[PDB]
Design a binder for this molecule. Structure first.
Ligand SMILES: CCCCCCCCCCCCCCCCCCCC(=O)O[C@H](COC(=O)CCCCCCCCCCCCCC)COP(=O)(O)OCCN
Ligand SMILES: CCCCCCCCCCCCCCCCCCCC(=O)O[C@H](COC(=O)CCCCCCCCCCCCCC)COP(=O)(O)OCCN
Ligand SMILES: CCCCCCCCCCCCCCCCCCCC(=O)O[C@H](COC(=O)CCCCCCCCCCCCCC)COP(=O)(O)OCCN
Ligand SMILES: CCCCCCCCCCCCCCCCCCCC(=O)O[C@H](COC(=O)CCCCCCCCCCCCCC)COP(=O)(O)OCCN
Ligand SMILES: CC(C)CCC[C@@H](C)[C@H]1CC[C@H]2[C@@H]3CC=C4C[C@@H](O)CC[C@]4(C)[C@H]3CC[C@]12C
Ligand SMILES: CC(C)CCC[C@@H](C)[C@H]1CC[C@H]2[C@@H]3CC=C4C[C@@H](O)CC[C@]4(C)[C@H]3CC[C@]12C
Ligand SMILES: CC(C)CCC[C@@H](C)[C@H]1CC[C@H]2[C@@H]3CC=C4C[C@@H](O)CC[C@]4(C)[C@H]3CC[C@]12C
Ligand SMILES: CC(C)CCC[C@@H](C)[C@H]1CC[C@H]2[C@@H]3CC=C4C[C@@H](O)CC[C@]4(C)[C@H]3CC[C@]12C
Ligand SMILES: CC(C)CCC[C@@H](C)[C@H]1CC[C@H]2[C@@H]3CC=C4C[C@@H](O)CC[C@]4(C)[C@H]3CC[C@]12C
Ligand SMILES: CC(C)CCC[C@@H](C)[C@H]1CC[C@H]2[C@@H]3CC=C4C[C@@H](O)CC[C@]4(C)[C@H]3CC[C@]12C
Ligand SMILES: CC(C)CCC[C@@H](C)[C@H]1CC[C@H]2[C@@H]3CC=C4C[C@@H](O)CC[C@]4(C)[C@H]3CC[C@]12C
Ligand SMILES: CC(C)CCC[C@@H](C)[C@H]1CC[C@H]2[C@@H]3CC=C4C[C@@H](O)CC[C@]4(C)[C@H]3CC[C@]12C
Ligand SMILES: *[C@@H]1O[C@H](CO)[C@@H](O)[C@H](O)[C@H]1NC(C)=O
Ligand SMILES: *[C@@H]1O[C@H](CO)[C@@H](O)[C@H](O)[C@H]1NC(C)=O
Ligand SMILES: *[C@@H]1O[C@H](CO)[C@@H](O)[C@H](O)[C@H]1NC(C)=O
Ligand SMILES: *[C@@H]1O[C@H](CO)[C@@H](O)[C@H](O)[C@H]1NC(C)=O
Lengths: 344, 344, 344, 344
């Protein structure tokens, strides 16, 4: 039913499932905006496919040819099925709009499924190629941040009663390499191109005259070519073509609204803001150097992933509340850190 | 069946599922009133869609055109399907009420699903954008309250046998920022606007003459335009239009009753009452300062979320019972706190 | 529905399920490229089979013979079923394209299923014959790497405050044996041959005239051979043949794009690059000798499997970050290793 | 659907499920070749049964008798059902090929299911009679091997810083008894005989003229015997007989390819090679005596089961890597064993 389709595709965790494995425990591995874009671009065409053939919106068979009254039920069924299979056969049918509109009307669900698959492909390539590496690197970075926070609080407590910046060096090294950012931009660009092509196709499909679904059909090949009792042609109409056009314009609207989001996603350096690591600069055990901005490198992408999935880090949360309290400046950062006692 | 739909949509945890993740363990992340509003506004139109096409209420096909007796079954089926697809084609049909009523009668389930999706969108935006931040902040606040309660009871026990207000400073800082409250008000306002538009549409749909479902249909395009055996027109009726109007007025009543709730929700400062933190003011380790009221800021929203999901805090429950006992004044707050022995 | 099939076969973990057993905990046991190739080559033909007979794309029965009007419904049904069963019987039918096109049109789903099974066979043979051995060997290798890393860090810590290369000897011994690599190459080659044969078949099927689906059928055997009221022949058409050809060309395109991937897979020594063990050469407890390249031996395959599933090793990750930091050369490898404190 | 059947029967763990009980944790209890043979011989005929009546390959009803035009739909249905039930009644029908072909055409699914059940019977008898005993014995043997390995490594460590061969005596005793091997050979031989009988039946079924499915049917018993309006006979055809023959030849090919595998399985002593226990002979605590070869006794079968499910033993894996390293001979077996430190 329509409501069942809605529950499956919008109100359920459709493509929102976290990786089912212990390797990525709590790691999104995909930005929220990218996940939203993929979920829409994939589950919208599927939802429209399901809707267009819902038991309520669908009168019945997808084509009716209006055989003569003399024709029996199965003769008329032969006519309808023959014309359905003959939309491909150009000789059989003669339609003013041509044969491409008939092809599109017959295979619209296939085309929507193709667009959905093509849009799901780049996210899958990301999740299967560049996701494990970033997951491992980000897990190491979070562990290092937790360890340095613990060491700093232990030092502060000892004072009240190595020291090498490994994480900073690793981030600096990531500043050079750009394979991950190149893959990310390539997959986003392919998604954008697929969306644009889908918009072109949907606009063309919705621009039809709405009468191209009606085509003339001739079961006059073979032994029936010279038969007399059979009329030279029939009036066939492809039902649900109006529904297809409505859903196609809906998908076109959604995709044109979505494309600016993908373009904004492509410009990762601009998105790289609100320095996540700036909060850690007040730790004595952490060097006061952010050095993450203004670069078409994997460093900006790692900064984005950190700003996305750093809320799960207790040390980061503690430092964030310390920073927020520092806005008033009533107290002292080391005193607040010592009082917090948030090792684990 | 009707009962199955009821069990799925009203008697089950439809959209009442808690976040399936360890990050939010026991945190609602959504006020009870907001959750009720979203659940109604989403699962009502879906329930009505399912009901309108239930196997019992539905006689059968959604349109019947009453072809002549001479017409065969599949000729009549062609007529019915053609008219169903031609509700869009204005030239084919001539109805007194126009063609918009026919469009609405055909696509009412789609319109209800659209309203449900549009009403579910703002809650989803909230849960995916502003929910993680408030979850982390509120978890930190609850942990701080538990820790300060434990410290105060330990101090009392030591007396019988830092001290910095970090949580108060954090709340004071939240008094300034307003991004969360702005997002909350924006999503509530969008929900209200969607509800009002849905009410307008449902009132228009229910105000129809009830005879607009009957339209005249002409299969007279193409080779059949000059055919003689076919009548110039047919009498088609869109079945289930009365059911659609009944369910639409039901949804209109529900939404007009719900809109005052959304308006009341918009005025969060008025809702900010029954100070949750007032109970903690009797703790020696906690400063006697509430400072949370009369502000279009995130502080009021945090106060609401606390008053919502603070019952899970054992320290808060203990302080609440101490406060309630203090109404009589027979005993002493520190003595009762020491006797409680409710560290964990 | 079409969307359900898509969810099952592309958006779900179809053939992507990890081995359901404690023996292989986190071990892929199959390279990512090989898994992708198998998943495509298997779940594409199945998806096309499901699509070709979807409730929306399918008009109805797969063959209609257009019995005379005098014929009753069940007489026409007998004609259609007889011709469906007589596509095999060459005498009954006379078609210009022959009888092989009719066989193919009738049994296309069977042929796609056969290709899917034949393509799934070599992966299954691998997973049931050569997977347990490589799993055990690789688990031992990872355990040895973890143990040597722990020993080296313990030695470094002791200095700050046996020694036999068992793993290197085992890898060197693997350099000689080649049964695993021979099995891998044989299964890949069989997969490639099956893909090529499938491409040949699909090209032949798509090269048909598109009118071979229309064949002449004669129910004139037995008592009906000399019957007069029955016409000497009927015009039968195999519906969905156009859909079969469309999906067959789609599968042909996918398989021709996939075959280069399989050919590249066959050349494992070229794939053996980015020495995984090179990072471990900086450990005092590990001998400085890689000795893994330029060989049609199981050593290259083991190197590939290591480069695939070594990210799960904490010691390997730590050594990798040490290597990446060494690019700048600011610090010292032993000092960084001591500071890391990543025993477990 | 066809793809669903494929997923259930070839791509899923059909009859590949490990024993669902804690008694056999990780013990196959069935050789890989035997499991493959059983899985094929059982799930192939079931798959063919499902395929032959798939919603796509099946035109409709399994028999059509071509009643006269004067006959009504339910008169024709009576004719078809009567002939379907009268394939057994020899007097009613007169077919050139006889009545056995009609029996076979009607009950082919039953015959395939019978063959599948008969082939599944011997494996079930094994798993319910001789599997628990071998499971217990093999678990004891693995535990003894682990214990002796632990004792030997402990002795080596003590030197660096009872002694009775219980397992060897148990294996020697198993050398005498042969009940398990006799049961194994009997079940394999019964499986082979069932496969041969199935091949005979399938060859006979596929050797039919392909026109035996067409039989003459006479509804002329009872009050209708002397009725005039009813024709003396009808032309009935059993649909799907061609599909049955195709699938039967497929099953015949599979079974003839499989029978050599079963014959090779029967010769267990030849399969008994690559002495698993030879690796343990280098342990000081283990006597240097294999004494397992060249015997129609349970010892060879136990050797096969060990070679199958010994990879799960850490001590065996360690000894195997020690053996492989000994190929070069660079080091010493006791030194390598001491350095390994693989007690558990
Ligand atoms: C994806 C979207 C593809 C849509 C665009 C396809 C480009 C078609 C260009 C060729 C057109 C062509 O040959 O001319 C028409 C025939 O088209 C044809 O006969 C070819 C029809 C094109 C194929 C449409 C079917 C798409 C199936 C998608 C399946 C995906 C499934 C994946 C799981 C003639 O007619 P006319 O009107 O152009 O001219 C008639 C008067 N001059
Ligand atoms: C959402 C609710 C939308 C309802 C309001 C739509 C505004 C329509 C304004 C245009 C009306 C128009 O062009 O005039 C009518 C034709 O309408 C048309 O032909 C356009 C019909 C409007 C589209 C209705 C279909 C809604 C489909 C929703 C799908 C959502 C799915 C999302 C998953 C003519 O006839 P008349 O009677 O006005 O005048 C006849 C005598 N002057
Ligand atoms: C797998 C793909 C197999 C396709 C290629 C099969 C090779 C056929 C070669 C023999 C052809 C033959 O005997 O000649 C035709 C009859 O074919 C026949 O009567 C034999 C038809 C071949 C069998 C096709 C059915 C495949 C079923 C697959 C089932 C798999 C299920 C597994 C679970 C005559 O006609 P003509 O047109 O060639 O000449 C007519 C004018 N000279
Ligand atoms: C298992 C495979 C069994 C197939 C071989 C059965 C042996 C039949 C030997 C007796 C044949 C017989 O009595 O002669 C035919 C009648 O057969 C009959 O009337 C007996 C038909 C044999 C039974 C076939 C039905 C198998 C049902 C399997 C059900 C399994 C379900 C288990 C869950 C006469 O006709 P003609 O052509 O031989 O001679 C006609 C001109 N002389
Ligand atoms: C997804 C991508 C590939 C879709 C590409 C656009 C498709 C949907 C449409 C939009 C405009 C279309 C073209 C418009 C006009 C003509 C001229 C005609 O004489 C032949 C077909 C041809 C050349 C059409 C082919 C298909 C076409 C290119
Ligand atoms: C992503 C955005 C830009 C998509 C907007 C849809 C655009 C591309 C659509 C809307 C209307 C469409 C046009 C409608 C009609 C025709 C006439 C036909 O003979 C050739 C294609 C052509 C000229 C179409 C080309 C594509 C088109 C311009
Ligand atoms: C969800 C929102 C967009 C719904 C908006 C209201 C819809 C349901 C209805 C209510 C009143 C309607 C209008 C009433 C009268 C007319 C005048 C007529 O000559 C053209 C249509 C037009 C202009 C209608 C368009 C659709 C309309 C605006
Ligand atoms: C949220 C609350 C206010 C909704 C209450 C429903 C109201 C808005 C409904 C109920 C009856 C409706 C009217 C019924 C009939 C017509 C005549 C038509 O030619 C134009 C629209 C118009 C004038 C409708 C406008 C909307 C309407 C006034
Ligand atoms: C999967 C593998 C086995 C498929 C092999 C190719 C199949 C699909 C096709 C492609 C070309 C075909 C051949 C083309 C021409 C002829 C000549 C004709 O007089 C008899 C059939 C015969 C000999 C065909 C047999 C089937 C054939 C070989
Ligand atoms: C893997 C790649 C190479 C596959 C590409 C498809 C090729 C092999 C296909 C496409 C068109 C096909 C041809 C189409 C028509 C005929 C005529 C027929 O009488 C014999 C087979 C023959 C000659 C086919 C042989 C195979 C063919 C050449
Ligand atoms: C599974 C086992 C039992 C199958 C045994 C073979 C079956 C399928 C077939 C193969 C050959 C067949 C026989 C061939 C010829 C005749 C002679 C005829 O006048 C009576 C039936 C009889 C005697 C057939 C009986 C059934 C038969 C034995
Ligand atoms: C396991 C292997 C050997 C099976 C190979 C199938 C063999 C046994 C099949 C293939 C063709 C079959 C023959 C086909 C036709 C007839 C004629 C009939 O009047 C008696 C049975 C008889 C003589 C069949 C006996 C069995 C048969 C020889
Ligand atoms: C049909 O009859 C015409 C008469 O002109 C003839 O040309 C044609 O070949 C016939 N077709 C068939 C299929 O017999
Ligand atoms: C139908 O016949 C009329 C007669 O006036 C003619 O004008 C019209 O073009 C014909 N239509 C078709 C589709 O042939
Ligand atoms: C049909 O009648 C013809 C007349 O020539 C005869 O040859 C043939 O044998 C008959 N067929 C049957 C099945 O009785
Ligand atoms: C049918 O009529 C015949 C006439 O010869 C007679 O012999 C036979 O008994 C009748 N059968 C029945 C069932 O009445």
């Amino acid at each position: 039913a329509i409501a069942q389709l809605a529950t499956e595709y919008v109100f359920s965790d459709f493509l929102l499932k976290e990786p089912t494995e212990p390797k990525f425990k709590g790691l999104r591995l995909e930005l929220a905006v990218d996940k939203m874009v993929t979920c829409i671009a994939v589950g919208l065409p599927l939802l429209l496919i399901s809707l267009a053939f819902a038991q309520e919106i669908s009168i019945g068979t997808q084509i009716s040819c209006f055989s003569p009254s003399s024709f029996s039920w199965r003769q008329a069924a032969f006519v309808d099925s023959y014309c359905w299979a003959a939309v491909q056969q150009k000789n059989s049918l003669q339609s003013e709009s041509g044969n491409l509109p008939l092809w599109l009307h017959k295979f619209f669900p296939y085309i929507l499924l193709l667009f959905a698959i093509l849009l799901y492909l780049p996210p899958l390539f990301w999740r299967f190629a560049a996701a494990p590496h970033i997951c491992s690197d980000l897990k190491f970075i979070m562990e290092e941040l937790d360890k340095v926070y613990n060491r700093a609080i232990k030092a502060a407590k000892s004072a009240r009663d190595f020291k090498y910046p490994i994480v900073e060096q690793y981030l600096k090294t990531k500043k050079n390499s750009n394979n991950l950012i190149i893959k990310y931009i390539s997959c986003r660009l392919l998604t954008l191109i697929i969306i644009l092509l889908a918009c072109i196709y949907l606009g063309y499909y919705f621009s039809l005259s709405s009468l191209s679904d009606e085509f003339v059909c001739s079961i006059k090949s073979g032994i029936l070519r010279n038969d007399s009792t059979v009329p030279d042609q029939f009036q066939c109409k492809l039902i649900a073509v109006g529904i297809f056009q409505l859903l196609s314009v809906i998908n076109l609207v959604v995709y044109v609204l979505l494309a600016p989001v993908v373009v904004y996603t492509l410009f990762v350096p601009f998105r790289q803001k609100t320095d996540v690591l700036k909060v850690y600069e007040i730790l004595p055990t952490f060097d006061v150097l952010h050095f993450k901005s203004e670069g078409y490198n994997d460093l900006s992408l790692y900064n984005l992933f950190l700003e996305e999935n750093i809320s799960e880090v207790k040390s980061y949360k503690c430092l964030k509340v310390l920073e927020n309290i520092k806005s008033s400046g009533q107290g002292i950062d080391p005193m607040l850190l010592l009082t917090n006692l948030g090792m684990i």
